[PDB]
Scaffold this active site. Structure first.
Site, PDB file in Angstrom:
ATOM      1  N   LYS A 183       0.243   4.187   0.602  1.00  0.00           N
ATOM      2  CA  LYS A 183      -0.077   5.093   1.702  1.00  0.00           C
ATOM      3  C   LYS A 183       0.394   4.557   3.048  1.00  0.00           C
ATOM      4  CE  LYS A 183      -4.302   6.956  -0.451  1.00  0.00           C
ATOM      5  NZ  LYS A 183      -5.781   7.056  -0.294  1.00  0.00           N
ATOM      6  N   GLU A 184       0.802   3.293   3.083  1.00  0.00           N
ATOM      7  CA  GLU A 184       1.259   2.702   4.330  1.00  0.00           C
ATOM      8  C   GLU A 184       2.723   2.259   4.278  1.00  0.00           C
ATOM      9  OE1 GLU A 184      -1.839  -0.242   4.983  1.00  0.00           O
ATOM     10  OE2 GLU A 184      -3.191   1.286   5.789  1.00  0.00           O
ATOM     11  N   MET A 185       2.987   0.970   4.084  1.00  0.00           N
ATOM     12  CA  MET A 185       4.371   0.517   4.042  1.00  0.00           C
ATOM     13  C   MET A 185       5.069   0.878   2.728  1.00  0.00           C
ATOM     14  SD  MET A 185       3.893  -3.091   6.087  1.00  0.00           S
ATOM     15  CE  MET A 185       5.165  -3.120   7.282  1.00  0.00           C
ATOM     16  N   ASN A 215       0.843  -1.192   0.000  1.00  0.00           N
ATOM     17  CA  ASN A 215       0.000   0.000   0.000  1.00  0.00           C
ATOM     18  C   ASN A 215       0.883   1.249   0.000  1.00  0.00           C
ATOM     19  OD1 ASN A 215      -2.967   0.997   1.944  1.00  0.00           O
ATOM     20  ND2 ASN A 215      -1.769   2.088   0.394  1.00  0.00           N
TER      21      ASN A 215
END
Ligand code: HEC
Ligand code: HEC
Ligand code: HEC
Ligand code: HEC
Ligand code: CA
Ligand code: CA
Ligand code: CA
Ligand code: MG
Lengths: 308, 308
Positions: free
Chosen positions: A101-103, A99
């Site tokens: 937006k994450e990792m 993702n």
């Protein structure tokens, strides 16, 4: 007249070695592009399994779209994610890794990172039969570890098991109100929630600037707009702020809102106080294990890109 | 019986309860303004006590100015920080908490955050007699925890203590090259470094875009430009990348550079590999303790500010 809530039972991993490998991966920040973010960063097991902020901080401090739910007792969810788009823990785990937006990494890169370390390869061999590393085995291991993240032993469970003194008068009245008012219609079972999708804003809409539409994202049907998976109330004391937008900073506010828009019921201050007291008795035994010691990266390991 | 390096010995906390309190604070991200950064974020005890990136990620993903050193065995440092501006662990701990480039909070706020929680107040009382929380007690406790972060048991230590088989042929020759070339001038004692300030670039300058001036920032003496506290080589295998600017990604590169600019010695590929093999035998027993379980924030706790 059986209780709408049942005690959480201790869990023995089907595969202890797999759960240990999963534990390590859950705490390994090298699964992320930056080498700084691990599952534990956003689901902090020292704090109740979440990041305790409105929405999650991702790669390069991106402000996340929704409040991170707790991994504690998540094995009991009928599906994963606020809109239940993921079938189970295994499927879920593949998401954050890739993702942006994450990792912000990729399954391909994550595989190479883990495989570059002999100590990890040896564990994959012990657990799966060969030292080959794949996102499939990675998510299978993380899922196994998460199955162990249940929290039995809360005061409420002790009361359910027969210990009448586990709850004080306010807590008992709180539970009676929780049941009598109608909360158990949606928050029930061992997890006191997590077993169905319900509308957030039955009698009146939930006021928020957050654009999340819930289940409608999966079905596209207007009838599913604002329909979300019912969160577990276990350990709710540790997972503030509340609701998918993290809009309710306190449990009192969450309870008043729930009574108002889900039941058309305006609780008075003492009623709210008692329900909140009851909710805190839903905090169980927290993860009890040694801080995982991870193998060092070596010259073959893809290097972290925190700023690149 | 008189090697230039001596074994590391286990450290039992003078005050066990105090070290336990320090451990909890070290892992508490609420000491930071964002509520997302703890000491462990940049000194990851699952990875060797550092963040394993060129320079540290701070509040709002600020790119730090220098490589984060390991907290492992830091109790053996003659002073703290690359320029030794902090006299001891206690003094050092106050820095990051209020450093706008790191945790970005203030001593006043951290005190209010910790004191808001009854569970913490209770611990401070059983430790310091009183239940009031001060930045002084917070840092005293953290420093106490850090005193326990020593790493005894490395293969090299076993060798120094009588086990002639603890090291293989290459590792032993590597040690002999280390001792015979001049490395122990600066990397000696139980920490294989950390006991003095030395010039980085004795025979030739260390090229880098990093502006850090070292001891000069503290003494102002031009003679101290590029003079730094010598880093510990204990667990060097776990704290890549190397040097204060994080410019050397591998141990091979670090060793080659050190021999060249510090000793005016040009090691061939074989000698470098042997020294590297020796350096890896300096990795000791990593921290062995249960993942800390922290008390939940309550309605009286100052709320995290990750984005504001
Ligand atoms: C923050 C930057 C995160 C990282 C890193 C990881 N997770 Fe997460 N997770 C986060 C959010 C915002 C959400 C909700 C997203 C949505 O669209 O609803 C999640 C959700 C989960 C769940 C679902 C639980 C539920 O009750 O629905 C699980 C089981 C979970 N996350 C696990 C998990 C694992 C194992 C991670 C690492 C591989 C991981 N998450 C990282 C935010 C973040
Ligand atoms: C279904 C019609 C519900 C009834 C009846 C009650 N709750 Fe509920 N609750 C439900 C949902 C779908 C959600 C999530 C809504 C969202 O979009 O965020 C919730 C959430 C809560 C929470 C917060 C959980 C969390 O953020 O992790 C709390 C504390 C909670 N609900 C309490 C609660 C009480 C006390 C109720 C009766 C007075 C009650 N809920 C009824 C769905 C439903
Ligand atoms: C990253 C944003 C950090 C956080 C959070 C903490 N530390 Fe740190 N630390 C970091 C750097 C970049 C440096 C070097 C700074 C310099 O000017 O030299 C440090 C240094 C230390 C040290 C000194 C060790 C040595 O010099 O050998 C110690 C003992 C240390 N840090 C401890 C520590 C504690 C206890 C923290 C929380 C209160 C903490 N650090 C947070 C980067 C970051
Ligand atoms: C003093 C005159 C030194 C001699 C002789 C050697 N080293 Fe050294 N080393 C010294 C300093 C001041 C530093 C830090 C320099 C900086 O600005 O970063 C170092 C660092 C290392 C490292 C990296 C440690 C880390 O980054 O944490 C290694 C691996 C190292 N030194 C190895 C080493 C060897 C093998 C030596 C002889 C060939 C050697 N050093 C000599 C100071 C001095
Ligand atoms: Ca929450
Ligand atoms: Ca380093
Ligand atoms: Ca170099
Ligand atoms: Mg360079």
């Amino acid at each position: 007249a059986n209780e709408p809530i049942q005690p959480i039972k201790a869990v023995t991993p089907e595969n202890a070695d797999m759960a240990e490998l999963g534990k390590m991966l859950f705490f390994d920040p090298r699964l992320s592009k930056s080498g700084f973010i691990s599952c534990n960063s956003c689901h902090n097991l020292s704090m109740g399994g979440t990041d305790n902020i409105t929405t999650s901080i991702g790669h390069k401090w991106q402000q996340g779209p929704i409040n991170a739910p707790t991994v504690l007792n998540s094995s009991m969810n009928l599906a994963q994610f606020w809109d239940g788009r993921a079938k189970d823990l295994k499927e879920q785990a593949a998401g954050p890794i890739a993702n942006p937006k994450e990792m912000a990494s990729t399954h391909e890169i994550a595989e190479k990172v883990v495989a570059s370390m002999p100590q990890y390869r040896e564990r994959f061999k012990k657990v799966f039969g060969s030292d080959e590393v794949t996102i499939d085995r990675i998510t299978t291991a993380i899922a196994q570890f998460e199955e162990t993240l249940v929290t039995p032993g809360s005061k409420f469970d002790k009361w359910l098991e027969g210990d009448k003194n586990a709850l004080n008068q306010d807590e008992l009245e709180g539970y009676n109100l929780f049941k009598g008012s109608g909360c158990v219609q949606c928050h029930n079972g061992p997890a006191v929630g997590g077993s169905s999708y319900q509308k957030m804003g039955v009698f009146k809409p939930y006021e928020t600037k957050n654009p999340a539409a819930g289940r409608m994202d999966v079905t596209g049907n207007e009838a599913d707009r604002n329909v979300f998976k019912v969160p577990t109330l276990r350990n709710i004391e540790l997972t503030y702020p509340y609701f998918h937008d993290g809009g309710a900073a306190t449990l009192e506010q969450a309870v008043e809102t729930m009574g108002r828009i889900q039941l058309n019921r305006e609780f008075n201050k003492d009623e709210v106080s008692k329900i909140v007291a009851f909710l805190k008795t839903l905090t169980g035994d927290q993860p009890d294990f040694k801080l995982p010691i991870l193998p060092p990266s070596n010259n073959d390991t893809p290097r972290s890109q925190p700023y690149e």
